[PDB]
Amino acid sequence: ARDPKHDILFEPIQIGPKTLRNRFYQVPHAIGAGSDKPGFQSAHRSVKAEGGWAALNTEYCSINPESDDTHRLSARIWDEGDVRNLKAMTDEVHKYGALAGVELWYGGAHAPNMESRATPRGPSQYASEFETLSYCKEMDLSDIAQVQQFYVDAAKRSRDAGFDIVYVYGAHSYLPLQFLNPYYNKRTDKYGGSLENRARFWLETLEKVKHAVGSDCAIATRFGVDTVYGPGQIEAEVDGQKFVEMADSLVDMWDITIGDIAEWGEDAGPSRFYQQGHTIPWVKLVKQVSKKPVLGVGRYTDPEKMIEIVTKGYADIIGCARPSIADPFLPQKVEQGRYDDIRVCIGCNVCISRWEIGGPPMICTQNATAGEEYRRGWHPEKFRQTKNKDSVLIVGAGPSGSEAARVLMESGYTVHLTDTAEKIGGHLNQVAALPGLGEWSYHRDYRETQITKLLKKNKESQLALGQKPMTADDVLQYGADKVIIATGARWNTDGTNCLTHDPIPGADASLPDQLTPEQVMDGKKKIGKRVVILNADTYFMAPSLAEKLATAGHEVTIVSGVHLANYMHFTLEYPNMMRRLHELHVEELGDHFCSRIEPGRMEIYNIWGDGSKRTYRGPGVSPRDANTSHRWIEFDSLVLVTGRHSECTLWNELKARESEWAENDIKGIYLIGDAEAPRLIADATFTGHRVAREIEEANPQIAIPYKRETIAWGTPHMPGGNFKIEYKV
Amino acid sequence: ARDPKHDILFEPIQIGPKTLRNRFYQVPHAIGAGSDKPGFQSAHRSVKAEGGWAALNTEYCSINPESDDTHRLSARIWDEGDVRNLKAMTDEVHKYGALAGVELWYGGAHAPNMESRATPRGPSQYASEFETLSYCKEMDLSDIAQVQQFYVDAAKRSRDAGFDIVYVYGAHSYLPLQFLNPYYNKRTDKYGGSLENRARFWLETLEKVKHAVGSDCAIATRFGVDTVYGPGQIEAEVDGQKFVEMADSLVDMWDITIGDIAEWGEDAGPSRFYQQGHTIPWVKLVKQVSKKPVLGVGRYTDPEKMIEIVTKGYADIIGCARPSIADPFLPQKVEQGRYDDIRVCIGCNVCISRWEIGGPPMICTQNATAGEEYRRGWHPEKFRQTKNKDSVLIVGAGPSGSEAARVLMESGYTVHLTDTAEKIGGHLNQVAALPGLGEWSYHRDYRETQITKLLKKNKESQLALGQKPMTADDVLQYGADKVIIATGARWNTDGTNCLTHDPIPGADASLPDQLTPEQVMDGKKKIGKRVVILNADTYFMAPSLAEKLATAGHEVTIVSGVHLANYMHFTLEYPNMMRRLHELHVEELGDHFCSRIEPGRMEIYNIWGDGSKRTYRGPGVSPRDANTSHRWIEFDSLVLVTGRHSECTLWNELKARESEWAENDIKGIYLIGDAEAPRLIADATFTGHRVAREIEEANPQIAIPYKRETIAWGTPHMPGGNFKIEYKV
Ligand SMILES: Cc1cc2nc3c(=O)[nH]c(=O)nc-3n(C[C@H](O)[C@H](O)[C@H](O)COP(=O)(O)O)c2cc1C
Numbered sequence A, B: 001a002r003d004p005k006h007d008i009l010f011e012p013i014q015i016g017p018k019t020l021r022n023r024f025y026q027v028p029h030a031i032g033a034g035s036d037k038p039g040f041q042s043a044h045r046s047v048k049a050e051g052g053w054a055a056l057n058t059e060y061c062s063i064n065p066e067s068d069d070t071h072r073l074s075a076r077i078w079d080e081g082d083v084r085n086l087k088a089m090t091d092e093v094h095k096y097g098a099l100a101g102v103e104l105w106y107g108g109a110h111a112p113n114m115e116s117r118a119t120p121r122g123p124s125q126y127a128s129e130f131e132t133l134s135y136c137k138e139m140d141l142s143d144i145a146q147v148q149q150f151y152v153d154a155a156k157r158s159r160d161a162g163f164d165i166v167y168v169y170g171a172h173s174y175l176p177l178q179f180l181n182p183y184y185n186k187r188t189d190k191y192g193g194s195l196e197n198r199a200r201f202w203l204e205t206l207e208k209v210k211h212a213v214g215s216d217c218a219i220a221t222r223f224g225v226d227t228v229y230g231p232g233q234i235e236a237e238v239d240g241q242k243f244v245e246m247a248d249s250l251v252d253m254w255d256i257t258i259g260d261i262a263e264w265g266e267d268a269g270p271s272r273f274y275q276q277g278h279t280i281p282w283v284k285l286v287k288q289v290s291k292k293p294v295l296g297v298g299r300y301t302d303p304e305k306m307i308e309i310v311t312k313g314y315a316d317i318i319g320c321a322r323p324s325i326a327d328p329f330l331p332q333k334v335e336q337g338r339y340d341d342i343r344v345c346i347g348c349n350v351c352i353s354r355w356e357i358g359g360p361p362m363i364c365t366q367n368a369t370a371g372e373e374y375r376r377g378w379h380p381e382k383f384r385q386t387k388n389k390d391s392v393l394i395v396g397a398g399p400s401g402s403e404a405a406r407v408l409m410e411s412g413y414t415v416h417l418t419d420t421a422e423k424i425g426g427h428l429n430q431v432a433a434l435p436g437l438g439e440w441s442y443h444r445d446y447r448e449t450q451i452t453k454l455l456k457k458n459k460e461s462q463l464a465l466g467q468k469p470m471t472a473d474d475v476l477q478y479g480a481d482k483v484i485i486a487t488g489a490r491w492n493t494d495g496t497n498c499l500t501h502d503p504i505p506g507a508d509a510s511l512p513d514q515l516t517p518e519q520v521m522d523g524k525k526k527i528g529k530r531v532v533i534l535n536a537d538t539y540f541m542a543p544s545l546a547e548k549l550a551t552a553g554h555e556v557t558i559v560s561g562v563h564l565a566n567y568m569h570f571t572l573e574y575p576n577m578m579r580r581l582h583e584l585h586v587e588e589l590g591d592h593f594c595s596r597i598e599p600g601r602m603e604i605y606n607i608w609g610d611g612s613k614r615t616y617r618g619p620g621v622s623p624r625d626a627n628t629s630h631r632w633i634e635f636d637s638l639v640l641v642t643g644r645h646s647e648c649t650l651w652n653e654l655k656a657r658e659s660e661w662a663e664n665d666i667k668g669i670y671l672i673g674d675a676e677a678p679r680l681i682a683d684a685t686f687t688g689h690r691v692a693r694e695i696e697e698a699n700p701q702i703a704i705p706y707k708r709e710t711i712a713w714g715t716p717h718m719p720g721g722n723f724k725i726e727y728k729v
């Protein structure tokens, strides 16, 4: 049963002409669907409606072709075709009693317009600090009236599509905020200078939107109350609160954020730098002056933290984005008191990384069904029950193995999960011990809690940890109907890397002066004062080890053959990571790799050291002048972060002895996770989820087709339009 | 009439069971359409069919979901939905008497599979040097059988879709090439080691494909004959020629390329580094040992060069990619002797940049209709004729103005083009003088030639160059019905940049020790020994000026606040550009910007120097510890490359005096190109082309809507499929 203190989270709240059934609200957030993947958009938002979320919003929605985010994917409300596609979502959300909202967006020069090729307009002409090759035209008075009209027209179409909430989006340094912020606005007319002038564009837009649909829709506004850059941009207790007082009568609800667009990781705080409720100091400042309902995200996943901000008067509604992705049923679980069933977001920002890359669908480290609801028909809380009594043996309890176990158990199968390690988690148990990555353990905490609970529902199922390594013979004679090999991967020990695909002469982690990430994390092998980290991986390992070692007093130099922490650009961790490494005095040697290693020293070269001119010089000779940039650098300890390899020996033996499977009544053996190929934790988790869901298919090793959301030639996107080629002659 | 020497280019040639009408062949190349935008795919390929190209191929076509290039866009032939969408293209191409081909693709770990989430397979397990986080599973004998089956099934689907040519794609280091290349293949079984073993996967696949559709389709193979890395990978005279001898009897035509995937700019040679026919030394080696028709791209635009390679026996067919994008009608023009009407490709690779970015449609610097054929109905050789006699005045003869003039003239309007410059071309005249950019002048050569020719067709039209600057009074009294302001943009003189959007204290290009790009190119102002280039632009200007100054003996240091030459990663110029800067001893100071400038010295700081921890400290105080990395560096001359701004003074005056337009019989004035907002040359050209095409619309300043190719909710991509949400429970 639910704890009485949590009752407040279930009181309804009035926002203009609408009523939220409870205080759980999904703020606008990208998922890689927009108006292009209507099924994905509707399924993803509707399961949350079913899960109890009071209101579900689309991601930023473009009001006009001149605010086109291509290559990134945004929603669009340009014409009737968009109204049709988006309605699929509002209809499905209404089905479960929730409200639907749309975030009206105009990006100024931040929108690159790679599809439309149109010219974006802004308060002053500037080149975006985010999209550095994108410039806008300074708006004259008629430009202003025209863009304001775009908002009105968009709001109208939104009502036609069935939206209950319409936002005038002024966060992440988009249009309304550009007029308000002196960083962008250099105008000297009535739209620049003083706060009243700078606030004018926003105030007029709100008034016009409210006039157009205010009687049928709640008018909300998203506001970046502080750009977190100090004086020079927006400060909460200067322009921030004053703007709120000015616009308060026009808005039905305030949705607050902090930060800009270049560093919106300040808003979507990664667990690496920010804890739950990190935004509170800024958000509370708004309630202090507003008379309207206020909400402000802060990666809220804990009901105790939720009631605290509400009772303390910091906010009236609990806005979430990531917590809703990780667990679409969070509100229901809280309502029913099923706290231990909550799948807590680990703040990894991998969901965000997909949006940032531009084009691919969202994925989630915790929830393997995110993005799969529509195309694969995977509901996060409903599983097809087996009609047979097959038992399954799973070797390996890491992200992939533990998820496969969990899903199979939920499906009614008898499961035997084994590992040599003492706890569920696999490599994730080491990774969560890296500086700042503590919350990533929730991934294994959740599976541990769930597997334990599920064991009680089937006494034939078993959890065997701290065991001796399973061997081919052990597996063949275990007596299980099907076997899942989820043995993982290990970091390369011989220098093997993506640049050469070959070992590096002299690399050997068994030597006393060389180490792998595993040896560093175990903390047994001695590490000298001067450390060089040789890197060929673009994610978190090298930067994280650098931080760990530097804080421990070592002198660290990273020699990187690939762009250091490239993937961190997408997870929004990059800016603060570079700052952290800088304050720790970590030296970076980019554009360099290693040709050979000796005890205490290694030979490095610039990767752009070969001659620029290509000349055919016949066989045996390189077509460019030789790279002569080689130089030696010394080290006390060399840490190798060159790549990973699948630990698939067990699998290889089983495959070699496949003729014996039948004799032992083994119907099939499958390879998943890192053992199949080193993946991101999210995908490792996904492979486990997939073989479990498809264990009864013809070949569970390979995925069955998913529904594709691509246009069918012959069908025009514009209702009643002509799909045929028509030249204007 | 056509020069007789060029008759050979129009002789037919037999390829297996098919016959090519002439020697003009469009090899496979991406356009950002794939199987997702059937209209774009069919229109772009068919206009070339109408233009006389003998065969048109799709871009790389995925044979199965486990070879998914998302975020990049490829064609796909996975199911019936794809067959339907791709048939639109083959039908349309056949309608004009040309053949249609498809390039069957499986990419190994090079395909990141961000949409499918499937696991790629390869000869050995490796992390792609291109997609550094993407690993594949080592294939066992059943894996090999299954992948070869994918090819067979895709080939059968291709025939159903109406393709005449089917490729087994083995270039750009994709699957077949991975088995052949020791760099990837570390196998020790019958598929690795010796050449016969390394060639086995390709030979077997060719054989099975030929067996499945060889009687109905010509079987072609695209092969990267030399990886241009020297010993270690594929070398033309070693494994190259021998594999050709081995596979010769199986193929109907050889399509040859050089280079890998990480550096395919070696194939798609940028004019900055390679001239027309740059691949000859390698391509000719294949003809030397083959008994089948051979073709090898080399940015062929000149018919004289085309006959040279054919008569000298270097190739039998003229394969083109970029040349066909710049001019879909190149074949017809050569056939009719209209040599001066050929729109020559400048080898800028901006078309390619769009594919590389991932998701956006292709655009062309020379051909503003590329990508616009279907959605806007713009035919590159057909223009709607005007029914009135309006005269249009165009101020500025750069890429935008000259293109607007060309299109209006082709449409029958009376045009008056004027500029203060002595020649057509605007800023492009200075740009084409930078080291290696000489071929970019073809953009202005083409327009100079066409305008000159079009003047003869209407004696009222006029070209006035070398004139005094047009003033507002001059424009008002000129007597034109409509005016187009195309006055361009200039580089900032006060340090204004995308990072701060403000001037830099002490920046002033009128000072003796500071210069702008224009001042450097004019060659008048003196430049001292030690040069510092302050950059905040991500394209070619800073690197090009650095090269120019270094070769002239100056000591150059580039202080860059953004990723130096970032956009060049996309144009494939980056690798050779960095090697060039390295040879020239150009020092790079990335992740640094400038706070203030003094005579002979400037203060720089690390952009990541602020504290990593964010703490709310109230208004007036920055939430992070202060950046204290500031230090001073000296210079003899400082070159400012911080950004551009529109030169729109004339426009501003005309708009201020808008009440005077009517009395002067001016129906409208429009702002285009860089003067509206600094753009890439391709987009500047596009704005001119667009106002010209839409001069009669209600508001020519803003583009009319284009046909959108997005799915319509309610229509399944799979014929007969179910579009509704269906959960598997
Ligand atoms: C995948 C993703 C994409 C985002 N896209 C948007 C967007 O379209 N519009 C917007 O206003 N905010 C966007 N956000 C920001 C979120 O609305 C939110 O402010 C941020 O994730 C912090 O909320 P949380 O801590 O509850 O996740 C995005 C966040 C996520 C997780």
Ligand SMILES: Cc1cc2nc3c(=O)[nH]c(=O)nc-3n(C[C@H](O)[C@H](O)[C@H](O)COP(=O)(O)O)c2cc1C
Residues within 6 Å of the ligand: B027, B028, B029, B030, B031, B058, B059, B060, B103, B171, B222, B257, B267, B268, B269, B297, B298, B299, B300, B319, B320, B321, B322, B323, B351, B352, B355, B362
């Ligand atoms: C826009 C573009 C995309 C390309 N995509 C492909 C592709 O899908 N498949 C392929 O085999 N080659 C691709 N290429 C390579 C071209 O086929 C060709 O080898 C290269 O551009 C050199 O030919 P050219 O010099 O005539 O342009 C691409 C080139 C271009 C221009």
Ligand SMILES: Nc1ncnc2c1ncn2[C@@H]1O[C@H](COP(=O)(O)OP(=O)(O)O)[C@@H](O)[C@H]1O
Residues within 6 Å of the ligand: A395, A396, A397, A398, A399, A400, A401, A418, A419, A420, A421, A425, A426, A427, A428, A468, A469, A470, A471, A486, A487, A488, A489, A647, A650, A672, A673, A674, A675, A684
């Ligand atoms: N032969 C074996 N018997 C039992 N457990 C094994 C065996 N080989 C490996 N393991 C375990 O398999 C697990 C693999 O987990 P992990 O590396 O996290 O992979 P993934 O990310 O694919 O889940 C590890 O906990 C490892 O101890």
Ligand SMILES: Nc1ncnc2c1ncn2[C@@H]1O[C@H](COP(=O)(O)OP(=O)(O)O)[C@@H](O)[C@H]1O
Residues within 6 Å of the ligand: B395, B396, B397, B398, B399, B400, B401, B418, B419, B420, B421, B425, B426, B427, B428, B468, B469, B470, B471, B486, B487, B488, B489, B647, B650, B672, B673, B674, B675, B684
């Ligand atoms: N007042 C003016 N009268 C005539 N020509 C002008 C005037 N101001 C600028 N121009 C010319 O306009 C042209 C702008 O060209 P450019 O910078 O190449 O722009 P775009 O790239 O937009 O075509 C330059 O050739 C410049 O000399």
Ligand code: SF4
Residues within 6 Å of the ligand: A322, A323, A325, A326, A344, A345, A346, A347, A348, A349, A350, A351, A352, A363, A364, A365, A366, A367
């Ligand atoms: S991908 Fe990570 S940050 Fe995003 S919702 Fe999932 S667990 Fe949270």
Ligand code: SF4
Residues within 6 Å of the ligand: B321, B322, B323, B325, B326, B344, B345, B346, B347, B348, B349, B350, B351, B352, B363, B364, B365, B366, B367
């Ligand atoms: S964009 Fe450039 S390289 Fe490409 S076809 Fe056009 S002119 Fe040629």
